[PDB]
Structure 1
Amino acid sequence: LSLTNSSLMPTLNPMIQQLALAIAASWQSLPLKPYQLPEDLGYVEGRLEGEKLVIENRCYQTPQFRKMHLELAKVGKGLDILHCVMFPEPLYGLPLFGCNIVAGPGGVSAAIADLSPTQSDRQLPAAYQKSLAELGQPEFEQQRELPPWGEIFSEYCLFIRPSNVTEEERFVQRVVDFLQIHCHQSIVAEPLSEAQTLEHRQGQIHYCQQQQKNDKTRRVLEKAFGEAWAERYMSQVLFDVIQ
């Protein structure tokens, strides 16, 4: 979790570096245990006919979080990516924390973050709604509309092109705020009924199936590793459907 040994970190976009550090700091003092990705994946690289893609993976678990996945990637020299999801244990009914930053030579092109619902009514639990509303509406100059598969995201979802350093920092601070709310709610969550656990499991399955429709991720993976590898990676490593 200490990113001091990361090969990629020193070379990544500064907003990605700050967000990676914030996520790792959020996790550092939790009751962590390792989570073994398929084939005990850590670092991987690939190339076909174009640029090489390099990926670093860290993954943990706690009693409240089934799988806490932080991934850093770089395609060639330009394109830097941070991907993070905390997949909840359905027993506790917590939402899904996720974020993705994509950056190039010209700066950050996409910054997305959310606490995504798992309830059948598509709403965050009441305590989250309350705490999130109290943060206020953040202002960003260049909002982006989610694609249709993004119906999975809550009304608090951020999806922007940051306009300047102030907005980069405002976005990272809001992600820190989401993490602080999420970690707090994890300590007050009670184990739920079997019917409720089942409901939350279904919401998490749906979230993964929709995230797998994102061709932006798929094309990056395919250009470096090919179709079969990308399908395995998206369905088994990034967005595994629990069952």
Structure 2
Amino acid sequence: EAVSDIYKPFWEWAAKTIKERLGDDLVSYPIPDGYLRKEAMVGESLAWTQSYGYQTKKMRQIRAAHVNGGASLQVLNLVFFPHMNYDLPFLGLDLVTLPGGHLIAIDMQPLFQTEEYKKKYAEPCMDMYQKHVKNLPWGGDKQYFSPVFLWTRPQEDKQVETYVFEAFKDYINKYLDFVEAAKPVTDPDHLARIRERQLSYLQYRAEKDPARGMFTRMYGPEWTERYIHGFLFDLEEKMESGEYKTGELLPCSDPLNFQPTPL
């Protein structure tokens, strides 16, 4: 038997790190009713999706979907979304384990591909990237890529538990370094372009995310569309709603949660 919940230690470390390094400012982000813990039968075993959601003064949303339907179906989809008054990149950590094998996509998806953006956010990561890409070779077959995109297909669970885990850890820590140092953008022209790039990226993810197929099979189309557009890649809904106010906390009374929520 292969490791059942290979990304459990990944999420636990991320939660510990988020809790410690963002502790002062970290508050809950609202998880819509019906999308905290979703279970279905697959095959043949129970298959659940656990959601986690947080926010800070600089981070519009940190959210994870942790999926587990046994060794053959495991996903950890963790993404950091900055507020629109910062020029920060996203941090995306998309870890997927299937019968075919592992699919690992780790990146700080940049708002811009200019030399000055790369100078600011790519070049400080080059050492980290070159270190980890040695162990995590290109995974095969762009405007949202950074120079330090790690796209790899480990063939053995041990590679995930070691090399992928260390890369996972380094990219989170390096990203949170950027977040600490980042300062509000006040120039209106810069803010207009930041918002354009954020909306373009989130529209792309909401429309083309590969989990749509998996979630539709497990829970049906309606739940899948609401999860994707209403939580995982929810900026456009929150903006059209009028809930999103740049740099402002989204009201939510739920307490911080970092552990599975028994259904």
| TM-score with structure 2 setting the length | 0.76
How does 1:11-160 map onto structure 2 within 5 Å?
A: 11-13=4-6, 16-29=7-20, 30=22, 31-39=25-33, 41-46=35-40, 53-75=47-69, 78-104=72-98, 108-119=101-112, 121=114, 124=117, 126-137=119-130, 138-140=133-135, 142-145=137-140, 151-160=143-152
Native 8 Å contact 2:107 2:149 kept in 1: yes
Among 160, 164, 178, the residue aligned to 1:171: 164
Query: How well do the aligned residues superpose, as a CA RMSD in angstroms?
Result: 2.8
CA distance in 1, matches of 2:122, 2:37: 37
Q: Which residue does the alignment assign to 2:154? A: 162
Native 8 Å contact 1:48 1:225 kept in 2: no
CA distance in 1, matches of 2:116, 2:144: 10
Native 8 Å contact 1:100 1:111 kept in 2: yes
CA distance in 2, matches of 1:123, 1:154: 13
Q: Which residue does the alignment assign to 2:217? A: 223
Among 199, 213, 221, the residue aligned to 2:193: 199
Which SS does the other structure have where 1:185 is aligned? helix
Aligned pair in 2 of structure 1 residues 73, 141: CA closer, same or farther (>3 Å)?
closer
CA distance in 2, matches of 1:189, 1:141: 29
Q: Name the % identity.
A: 22
CA distance in 2, matches of 1:121, 1:40: 41
CA distance in 1, matches of 2:123, 2:190: 21
| TM-score with structure 1 setting the length | 0.81
Number of residue pairs the alignment of both structures matches: 228
Deviations, residues 165-203 of structure 1 (Å, cap 9, x unaligned): 256422221222211221112122111023222322222
Higher mean alpha-carbon deviation, 116-125 vs 223-232, is at 116-125
Deviation of the 1:122 alpha carbon: 9.2
Deviations, residues 197-238 of structure 1 (Å, cap 9, x unaligned): 232222221121112343631111111222222222211111
Q: Which residue does the alignment assign to 2:176? A: 183
CA distance in 2, matches of 1:136, 1:130: 10
Deviations, residues 108-138 of structure 1 (Å, cap 9, x unaligned): 5111111011237497453322211132522
Aligned pair in 2 of structure 1 residues 22, 213: CA closer, same or farther (>3 Å)?
same
Higher mean alpha-carbon deviation, 36-45 vs 109-118, is at 36-45
Gaps of 5+ in 1: 1-9
Native 8 Å contact 2:42 2:69 kept in 1: no
Native 8 Å contact 1:100 1:113 kept in 2: yes
Which SS does the other structure have where 2:128 is aligned? coil
Higher mean alpha-carbon deviation, 214-223 vs 29-38, is at 214-223
| RCO comparison, higher one (Cα < 8 Å, 6+) | 2
Deviation of the 1:53 alpha carbon: 3.7
Gaps of 5+ in 2: 240-263
Aligned pair in 2 of structure 1 residues 52, 198: CA closer, same or farther (>3 Å)?
farther
Deviations, residues 122-159 of structure 1 (Å, cap 9, x unaligned): 9745332221113252224652235xxx5422121111
Native 8 Å contact 2:136 2:164 kept in 1: no
Deviations, residues 71-124 of structure 1 (Å, cap 9, x unaligned): 211236621111101101111211100111111467x51111110112374974
Runs of 4+ in 1 over 4 A off after TM superposition: 47-52, 120-125
